Amino acid sequence: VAPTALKGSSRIIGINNTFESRKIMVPPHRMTPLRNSWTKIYPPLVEHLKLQVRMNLKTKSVELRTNPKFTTDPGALQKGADFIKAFTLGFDLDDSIALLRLDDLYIETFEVKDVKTLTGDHLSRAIGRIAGKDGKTKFAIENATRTRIVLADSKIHILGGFTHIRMARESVVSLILGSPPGKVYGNLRTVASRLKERY
Amino acid sequence: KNSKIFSPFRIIGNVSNGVPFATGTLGSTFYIVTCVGKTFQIYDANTLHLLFVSEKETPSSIVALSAHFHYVYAAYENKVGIYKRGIEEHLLELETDANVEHLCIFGDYLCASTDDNSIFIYKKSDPQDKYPSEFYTKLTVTEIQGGEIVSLQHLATYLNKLTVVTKSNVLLFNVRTGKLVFTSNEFPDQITTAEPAPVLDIIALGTVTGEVIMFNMRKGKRIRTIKIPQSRISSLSFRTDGSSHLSVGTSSGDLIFYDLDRRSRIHVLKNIHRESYGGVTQATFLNGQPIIVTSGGDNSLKEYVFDPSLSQGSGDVVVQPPRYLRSRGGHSQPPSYIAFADSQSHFMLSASKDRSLWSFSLRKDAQSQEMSQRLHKKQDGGRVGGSTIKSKFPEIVALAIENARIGEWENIITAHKDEKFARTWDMRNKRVGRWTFDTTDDGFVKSVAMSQCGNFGFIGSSNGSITIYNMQSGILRKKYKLHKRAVTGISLDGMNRKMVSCGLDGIVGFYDFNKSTLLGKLKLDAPITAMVYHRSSDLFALALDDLSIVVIDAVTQRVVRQLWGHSNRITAFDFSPEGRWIVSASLDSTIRTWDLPTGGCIDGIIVDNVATNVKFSPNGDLLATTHVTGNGICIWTNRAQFKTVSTRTIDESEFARMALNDIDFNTYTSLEQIDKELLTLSIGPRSKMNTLLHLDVIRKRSKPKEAPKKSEKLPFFLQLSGEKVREGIAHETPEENKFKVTGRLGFESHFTKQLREGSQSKDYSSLLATLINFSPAAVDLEIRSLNSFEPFDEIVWFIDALTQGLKSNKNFELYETFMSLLFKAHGDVIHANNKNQDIASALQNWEDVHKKEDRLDDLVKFCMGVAAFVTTA
Amino acid sequence: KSDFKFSNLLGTVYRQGNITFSDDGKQLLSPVGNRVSVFDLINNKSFTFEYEHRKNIAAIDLNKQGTLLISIDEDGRAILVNFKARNVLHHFNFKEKCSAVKFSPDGRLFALASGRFLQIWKTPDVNKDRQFAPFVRHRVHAGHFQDITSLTWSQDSRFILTTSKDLSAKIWSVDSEEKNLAATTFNGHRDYVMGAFFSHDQEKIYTVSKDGAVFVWEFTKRKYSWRITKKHFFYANQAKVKCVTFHPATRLLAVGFTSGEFRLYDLPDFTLIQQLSMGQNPVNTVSVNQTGEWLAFGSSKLGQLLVYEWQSESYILKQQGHFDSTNSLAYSPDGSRVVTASEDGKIKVWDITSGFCLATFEEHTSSVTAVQFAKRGQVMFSSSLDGTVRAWDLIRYRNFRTFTGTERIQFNCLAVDPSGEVVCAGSLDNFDIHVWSVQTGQLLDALSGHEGPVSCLSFSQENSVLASASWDKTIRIWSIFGRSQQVEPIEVYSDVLALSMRPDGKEVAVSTLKGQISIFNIEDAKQVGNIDCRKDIISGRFNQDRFTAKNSERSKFFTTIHYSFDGMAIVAGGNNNSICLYDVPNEVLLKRFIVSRNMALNGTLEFLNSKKMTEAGSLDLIDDAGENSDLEDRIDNSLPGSQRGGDLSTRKMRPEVRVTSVQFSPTANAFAAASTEGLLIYSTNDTILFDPFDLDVDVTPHSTVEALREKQFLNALVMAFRLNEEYLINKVYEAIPIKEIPLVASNIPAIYLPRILKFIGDFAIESQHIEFNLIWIKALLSASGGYINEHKYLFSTAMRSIQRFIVRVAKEVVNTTTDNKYTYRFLVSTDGSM
Amino acid sequence: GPYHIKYAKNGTHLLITGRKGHVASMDWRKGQLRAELFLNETCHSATYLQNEQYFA
Amino acid sequence: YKLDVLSSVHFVPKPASTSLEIRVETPTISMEDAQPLYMSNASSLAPQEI
Numbered sequence A: 001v002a003p004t005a006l007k008g009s010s011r012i013i014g015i016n017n018t019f020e021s022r023k024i025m026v027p028p029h030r031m032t033p034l035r036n037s038w039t040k041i042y043p044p045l046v047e048h049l050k051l052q053v054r055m056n057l058k059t060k061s062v063e064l065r066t067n068p069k070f071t072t073d074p075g076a077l078q079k080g081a082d083f084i085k086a087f088t089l090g091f092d093l094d095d096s097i098a099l100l101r102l103d104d105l106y107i108e109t110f111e112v113k114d115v116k117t118l119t120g121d122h123l124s125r126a127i128g129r130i131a132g133k134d135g136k137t138k139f140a141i142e143n144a145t146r147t148r149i150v151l152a153d154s155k156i157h158i159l160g161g162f163t164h165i166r167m168a169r170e171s172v173v174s175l176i177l178g179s180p181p182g183k184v185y186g187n188l189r190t191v192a193s194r195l196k197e198r199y
Numbered sequence B: 001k002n003s004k005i006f007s008p009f010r011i012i013g014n015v016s017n018g019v020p021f022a023t024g025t026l027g028s029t030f031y032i033v034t035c036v037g038k039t040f041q042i043y044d045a046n047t048l049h050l051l052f053v054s055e056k057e058t059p060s061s062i063v064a065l066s067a068h069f070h071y072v073y074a075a076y077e078n079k080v081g082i083y084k085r086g087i088e089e090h091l092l093e094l095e096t097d098a099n100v101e102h103l104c105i106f107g108d109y110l111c112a113s114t115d116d117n118s119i120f121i122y123k124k125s126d127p128q129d130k131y132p133s134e135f136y137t138k139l140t141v142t143e144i145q146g147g148e149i150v151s152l153q154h155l156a157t158y159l160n161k162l163t164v165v166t167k168s169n170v171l172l173f174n175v176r177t178g179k180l181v182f183t184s185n186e187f188p189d190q191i192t193t194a195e196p197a198p199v200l201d202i203i204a205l206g207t208v209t210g211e212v213i214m215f216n217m218r219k220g221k222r223i224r225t226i227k228i229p230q231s232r233i234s235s236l237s238f239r240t241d242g243s244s245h246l247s248v249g250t251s252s253g254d255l256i257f258y259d260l261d262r263r264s265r266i267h268v269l270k271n272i273h274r275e276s277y278g279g280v281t282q283a284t285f286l287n288g289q290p291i292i293v294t295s296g297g298d299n300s301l302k303e304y305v306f307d308p309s310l311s312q313g314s315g316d317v318v319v320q321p322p323r324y325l326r327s328r329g330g331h332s333q334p335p336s337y338i339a340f341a342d343s344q345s346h347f348m349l350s351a352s353k354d355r356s357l358w359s360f361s362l363r364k365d366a367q368s369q370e371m372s373q374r375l376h377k378k379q380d381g382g383r384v385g386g387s388t389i390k391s392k393f394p395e396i397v398a399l400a401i402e403n404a405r406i407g408e409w410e411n412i413i414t415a416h417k418d419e420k421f422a423r424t425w426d427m428r429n430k431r432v433g434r435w436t437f438d439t440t441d442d443g444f445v446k447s448v449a450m451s452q453c454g455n456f457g458f459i460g461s462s463n464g465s466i467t468i469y470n471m472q473s474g475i476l477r478k479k480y481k482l483h484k485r486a487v488t489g490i491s492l493d494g495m496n497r498k499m500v501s502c503g504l505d506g507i508v509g510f511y512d513f514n515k516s517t518l519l520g521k522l523k524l525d526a527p528i529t530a531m532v533y534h535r536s537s538d539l540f541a542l543a544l545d546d547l548s549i550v551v552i553d554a555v556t557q558r559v560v561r562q563l564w565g566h567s568n569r570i571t572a573f574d575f576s577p578e579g580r581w582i583v584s585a586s587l588d589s590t591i592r593t594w595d596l597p598t599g600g601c602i603d604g605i606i607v608d609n610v611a612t613n614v615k616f617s618p619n620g621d622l623l624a625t626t627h628v629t630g631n632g633i634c635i636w637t638n639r640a641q642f643k644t645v646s647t648r649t650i651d652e653s654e655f656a657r658m659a660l661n662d663i664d665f666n667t668y669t670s671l672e673q674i675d676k677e678l679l680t681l682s683i684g685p686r687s688k689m690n691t692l693l694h695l696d697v698i699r700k701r702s703k704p705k706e707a708p709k710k711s712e713k714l715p716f717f718l719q720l721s722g723e724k725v726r727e728g729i730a731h732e733t734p735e736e737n738k739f740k741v742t743g744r745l746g747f748e749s750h751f752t753k754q755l756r757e758g759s760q761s762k763d764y765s766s767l768l769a770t771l772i773n774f775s776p777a778a779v780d781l782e783i784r785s786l787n788s789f790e791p792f793d794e795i796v797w798f799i800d801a802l803t804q805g806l807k808s809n810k811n812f813e814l815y816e817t818f819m820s821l822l823f824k825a826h827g828d829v830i831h832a833n834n835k836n837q838d839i840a841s842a843l844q845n846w847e848d849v850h851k852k853e854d855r856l857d858d859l860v861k862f863c864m865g866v867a868a869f870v871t872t873a
Numbered sequence C: 001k002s003d004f005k006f007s008n009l010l011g012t013v014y015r016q017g018n019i020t021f022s023d024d025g026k027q028l029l030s031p032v033g034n035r036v037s038v039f040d041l042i043n044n045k046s047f048t049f050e051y052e053h054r055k056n057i058a059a060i061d062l063n064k065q066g067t068l069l070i071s072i073d074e075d076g077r078a079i080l081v082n083f084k085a086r087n088v089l090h091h092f093n094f095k096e097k098c099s100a101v102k103f104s105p106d107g108r109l110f111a112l113a114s115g116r117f118l119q120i121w122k123t124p125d126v127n128k129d130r131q132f133a134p135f136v137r138h139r140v141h142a143g144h145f146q147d148i149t150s151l152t153w154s155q156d157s158r159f160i161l162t163t164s165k166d167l168s169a170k171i172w173s174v175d176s177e178e179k180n181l182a183a184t185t186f187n188g189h190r191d192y193v194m195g196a197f198f199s200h201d202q203e204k205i206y207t208v209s210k211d212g213a214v215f216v217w218e219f220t221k222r223k224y225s226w227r228i229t230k231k232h233f234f235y236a237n238q239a240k241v242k243c244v245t246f247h248p249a250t251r252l253l254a255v256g257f258t259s260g261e262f263r264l265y266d267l268p269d270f271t272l273i274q275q276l277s278m279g280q281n282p283v284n285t286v287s288v289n290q291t292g293e294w295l296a297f298g299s300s301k302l303g304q305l306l307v308y309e310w311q312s313e314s315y316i317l318k319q320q321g322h323f324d325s326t327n328s329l330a331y332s333p334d335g336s337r338v339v340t341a342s343e344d345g346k347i348k349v350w351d352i353t354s355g356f357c358l359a360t361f362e363e364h365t366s367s368v369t370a371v372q373f374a375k376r377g378q379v380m381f382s383s384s385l386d387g388t389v390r391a392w393d394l395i396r397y398r399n400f401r402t403f404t405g406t407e408r409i410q411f412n413c414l415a416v417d418p419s420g421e422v423v424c425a426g427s428l429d430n431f432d433i434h435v436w437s438v439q440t441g442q443l444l445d446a447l448s449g450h451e452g453p454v455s456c457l458s459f460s461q462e463n464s465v466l467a468s469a470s471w472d473k474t475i476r477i478w479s480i481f482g483r484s485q486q487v488e489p490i491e492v493y494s495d496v497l498a499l500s501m502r503p504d505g506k507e508v509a510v511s512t513l514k515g516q517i518s519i520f521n522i523e524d525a526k527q528v529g530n531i532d533c534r535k536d537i538i539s540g541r542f543n544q545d546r547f548t549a550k551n552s553e554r555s556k557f558f559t560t561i562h563y564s565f566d567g568m569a570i571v572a573g574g575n576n577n578s579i580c581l582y583d584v585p586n587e588v589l590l591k592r593f594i595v596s597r598n599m600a601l602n603g604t605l606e607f608l609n610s611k612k613m614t615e616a617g618s619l620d621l622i623d624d625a626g627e628n629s630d631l632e633d634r635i636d637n638s639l640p641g642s643q644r645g646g647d648l649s650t651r652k653m654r655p656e657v658r659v660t661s662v663q664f665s666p667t668a669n670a671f672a673a674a675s676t677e678g679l680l681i682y683s684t685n686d687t688i689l690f691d692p693f694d695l696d697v698d699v700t701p702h703s704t705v706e707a708l709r710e711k712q713f714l715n716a717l718v719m720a721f722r723l724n725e726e727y728l729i730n731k732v733y734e735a736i737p738i739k740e741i742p743l744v745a746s747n748i749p750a751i752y753l754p755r756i757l758k759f760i761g762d763f764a765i766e767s768q769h770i771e772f773n774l775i776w777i778k779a780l781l782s783a784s785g786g787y788i789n790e791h792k793y794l795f796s797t798a799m800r801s802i803q804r805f806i807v808r809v810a811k812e813v814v815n816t817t818t819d820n821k822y823t824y825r826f827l828v829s830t831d832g833s834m
Numbered sequence D: 001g002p003y004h005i006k007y008a009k010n011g012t013h014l015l016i017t018g019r020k021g022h023v024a025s026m027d028w029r030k031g032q033l034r035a036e037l038f039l040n041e042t043c044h045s046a047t048y049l050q051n052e053q054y055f056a
Numbered sequence E: 001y002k003l004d005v006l007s008s009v010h011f012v013p014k015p016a017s018t019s020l021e022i023r024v025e026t027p028t029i030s031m032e033d034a035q036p037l038y039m040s041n042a043s044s045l046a047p048q049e050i
């Protein structure tokens, strides 16, 4: 240390992630990305958070337990558990690391059916509307609200600050209901400006 | 005795009170420590600039002063203090009631002599400690051993010996062992001074009958005897510049120099200091230079220098006489009159009973100067009538100064005791002027005044005549004759139109100076002693003989206020510059502040010495008062200029024994809303409404013309990633279920929760409160984020909240402005679903209220119609 | 009446020194030359302190608590100020060139970078009364071999980092026992070290050099010691770092380069957030808000002040002022805004309350000499030496018309008809007064008759005659309107320099070169008064003169004058250090105001220090440009003979104190004077004075209150005015019920009617009781409308104040109310579907 | 001040240049002043040319 | 520029010439300088011009 030195809630919302233990089940589609990226997934859990990690091949789950003799931060277990889940939900690894690094990032999860009961081509129509051509619309929502979104079919997961995901979610909901695209874009311009402003 | 408006600042005009100063050397330079009553001042020997003053006034007068390098030791009563840079660092308290008399410091030992012939020795706790603190021992000289102690001295090259000098004889005390090493032979004459010589083992002793003895301690024998018949020695000092000279000061005010080598007198300086005040109280040669610093009780400090000899060879015999080099000084007796020379706290005029008038600088003592009295040659060419022996003008009883014409001609008038004319002075040149104003009625001058334009001078005679002169040429212009008794005051308003006078007969005359007519006359019950005229407000106060201050308005010629309470004559008084207070002093040893709007005493002081004069600075920041004792001027800071002062009347009975809050602080806070029916805007900036309506457009202007380049590799979450506070709506944390569009429970935003709680409780007062607090950016964000999807619960609740707000009639512009934003962001949703009952009823309830706030338009249109017509036709 | 006091300085937002945000972040302190100005961004209000240094300010600081302000000039003289009370506690001299002064974040100690010594002092306590020696020294540190560039406090008020020209950054400990903790010196920089900073944990020290290198210092093993773990470089081609600041909480590094661009970086990553360019002049000073959202930059050369909200890439504040360039000023008819004409050719509109430039116009190629509004106020006119007269429409900011003479003549004076239909301009080269028609733009005629250049012009607001004066020693009254044209010349003792027309239109005042303000009656063409001014004028010896100020005849005349709208007072100023306010009816000087007390300006002092004189000459006249380290400072671009119309660098001589123009405020009892430093605005708003009118013993602040308690409102109100106390008048004003207002309003004595109207005007503008005041204004005008019409000029300023309230705030409120009502009806009545 | 000093090669003459622009050339042994300029400029250094007659 | 400053800007005006400008319709606030206030709100093109 320099001589001049000074003298269990879960971030994800909508799903129950929870000497203590935490288990996270990995779906089949995330198995391979988990494999090649595990060389960079276990370090931050075991060294920074001081946790004990495994992959259960039999149950295809990530098993996480607190070490009473080594672990020090009581929230490390839940923090580590959420980080795995974000990777499980489909977010890129660097985005997932942000949850370990930052303490004010929340994941909001919801399905299209929750907003409104869509089926058949109409359900496909909404997923098309949220995504946009070549992903432009979701890209616009992501940058304007400073949020990361994963549109896995009819399930949407939004990562970012509290009010940020509130505004990204609102834009997504407005798209689902069928609000005119221009109005959604018009907001997406000004939501960005208002958020960054001091007053 | 403690004022609530005023506080002491320092004393102006004192350089020395007569106690022997102490010289101290830092490196090559030297400094002089002089006593001023209860505090000391440190001057630089090179320039005689003030450097430091004692931080706090000592409880009792200082008796002895000794300085060694940074530290200065000041003795008062039975306590010896140690000061560094004018701040006390430690206090030595002796254990006997006897008062300290003399003080000596050598090495780690500090020696204090009390009046009871008891010597106290202190020692350093540590060899490296800066100053002695610990109590070593006590040595007492008995009458058999010797007489009263004259002074303590320590010769060089003596290990732990203190040379105690008594009137009878000299003694040598070994402080370490506390034993009397040696006793001198009894001397016939009473010794009065002791000075170690630069030579070894020899101390110069001065007797009361003009004998200087070069006593040799090692041999215990006399070496030399200088004789000064009919004189008393007061100081001795040796020149260390390689010339064997001795300066012998005397109480008569003379300083003699002797050349020890040649056994001859070099010169005598006569009357350098007044004999009445103790003559040369101290004279010290600066170590290794020809400059000698001399002081006395007449409030002056001088320096004399020996120039090099004018003969190339035999420079010793041909000694140039000492030459005046520099000095600082003040009045020898208390000032009689004072006045502030300039609008700032810049310069201050003072005239004293020593017949000298001084201009004192509040901001640097070096700037203080004496106004010379050398006269101009008469314009006529006739010889001036005056005694050949030069004598200072008599004491100045009254003074008036103006600055409208400083530098063009004379600008000060002064009246003298028992003198039938008033003299003029010029501040810029700092010398007496060329005009003398005569009363022309064989009467002494009692009052002097000046017009603001600086063209006229008014002289009030003791026989009741007012003569008006012109300052530029000193020619008489008009003479007014109303009073039959002495005129004690004259004043002229700022406009040079109405003139007012007062006299001992008790009448106050009102004149029109332009037309030279008597506007009116007012008779008061008692004789009038003094006058102060306030030009800004046209009010003048008169100090009546019956112990009252009567305030009169010159415009209407009626008594407006009368102030009672003084138990004796009112020496002096003055108006505050803002015209709101009068401060008056009286012979009963008090100063009272009078609040004119209420006409009562708000503050009172009990001064030990009567305040003969009181004067405010034109700024109002400083109050200056002079006292019957003390050669200086007491300066007070006005605490009212940094905080408000309660105007509650002071308790008279408690004041004697010592010898609505909005109204009390002269402030008022406007109500939030006079009546529930009266429309009232928000308590905040009026740009808030304009900013809210045109937020987007103003921001577009704000954006830079050219886009800023940014690094391609940047953190996405940089804004969130701030180590730790920003209070923006961006920085909100959730407070602790099925998915809901507005907000999931436990994840909802604080604004929505207050709205939903408002919907259930049927009162949105909490929500309206937080809406007003919100910054304009936050307000736009929340209104837009409202749910716009059926059943339109949040929109309907919002309208009711704003409908409730208007009923209060408070903040109605902001509640109005919010609805301009609601339609801008959600107009289409309202339009498409206008037939919906919840929206239609919520809107309809709103319209009924909003229709009631149409009276404002009628008033605004009416006032414009008439205000344009009235101001135009 | 004549109790004026300096209130704020417009026309300048930054001259030099370091800018400091208030701790709350809602106020910006900007040194403007000789004074300190405070802008409240949130509340849209500004003030400038009364205290005045003897030279330009070099550094300032406000302590965290917000109670004490310390400002230091370029000689080291320091003035400590009680911020809340706006008064001066103590003047201190540090006998060196102090570069930076910074309060410790705790607030107990403040450190000073003077020469090669770091001086640490103890703060005086604000609550304690004033003393002879309030500052108590704590320690003086002498480790640096050359001057200190800047200093930084540690967050815990225990360590200080100082960066000097020794190519070194050095760390001290404020506590003696902790000297061993931090007694290290940091080396390795190629050029001057501009700034050194701590990280939030205080485990990392960053040092920045002028060449553009940033070093990260960390306490690590190679047994442990400070080392440069990583090194970074601003690869600026030729720009040198000029100012640096660091915000530990957000890890923000704002760097301002000499090329006029600034960069924002993140530490220790050194990712470039942004860089923008504010001009071609160096960025002198940069500062950061406490939260870290607002960055304030300043460029001394053009006096630009910029506050950047880097989060949203927005400008909270972006302004440019003038120095030694304001040639004229003109109030808006309501008085809310003031216009200025600058030698640059730019016409800038300043808002009085905020102190910021609302609009800028840059059509004019050359210097603008004069500006005047139409009586309506919507149109503006300006004359320039480029040879044109240009009409501006404020509602749309367009040069809707431009006039030009045939013979290519420079214009120096301008006057506009009250009807806003005729514009006339005079010249120093033509001897004729050109006249144009506003509607058509054609040259109606060229008025001839002067044998000397026309120095000034003005139209009568009522009679519509034109009065012109010249260096011909004459004044001519032109009856240009009417079937027949007449000219009536009036002779004068000397050349005429300025002219002002009484609002009545019956008299005209003229200042002559002899120093005489002569008032003539227009209809009779005979003199009605005369005022001497030569003795009143205060003129200072310049450093270059070889003759005394008393014998100097350089400026003993008044080059501009103006009446008070009441018609009883004249305010005059010239190429001198005085603004004199005379009272017309009695011909006396009410007050004199010193324009400046800065010795940097040339004309400030009557008497110069004899020490400066030598056999070589005045030490001030010796040019010391060679010593300056930077080339751009050393280079001399001055033309040999220039006097006006170019940049300061062109002069080679010090700026001269002078008042180009003066005017009274139409709406408030205040006047504005354009000078070299800027527009000095003197107002009576504080009104601390006690000026009772027709007071008696029975009237008392206590006695007034019972008159309220007894429900004798009229007696309470009248007695309130007689004391003339604002707080008492306010108390009675709000306690009167609405039912009784029409009764009381009719019964107010005629004498006190002007006072109440003034109060309502001053109170209503910022008060929140819009309807209550409007009820009062309705009551008074209806009751005493006839009286006001008879005495127009007694009530002129008061009546304009009421209109400004009714138009600027009252109308704006209803303008939205009528808007929502119509937007309401359209939404409900209309059919919306599909 | 400050003053920069340069002696002649043979040591007979002295050249001092003040920073504020005071240049003086003198014969220091005999106390004779050859030339003294009061250039109101910033002088940095000066030197004697072939002999004391000329200096730069 | 150099000649004008040398003559203390007592120069003679240049020949008058006519040039064309293009005015773009914008809210009047945009034309103003940047601070938390605007002094007009109208459009930059008059109704006849539209």
Ligand SMILES: [Mg+2]
Binding pocket: C484
């Ligand atoms: Mg005819």
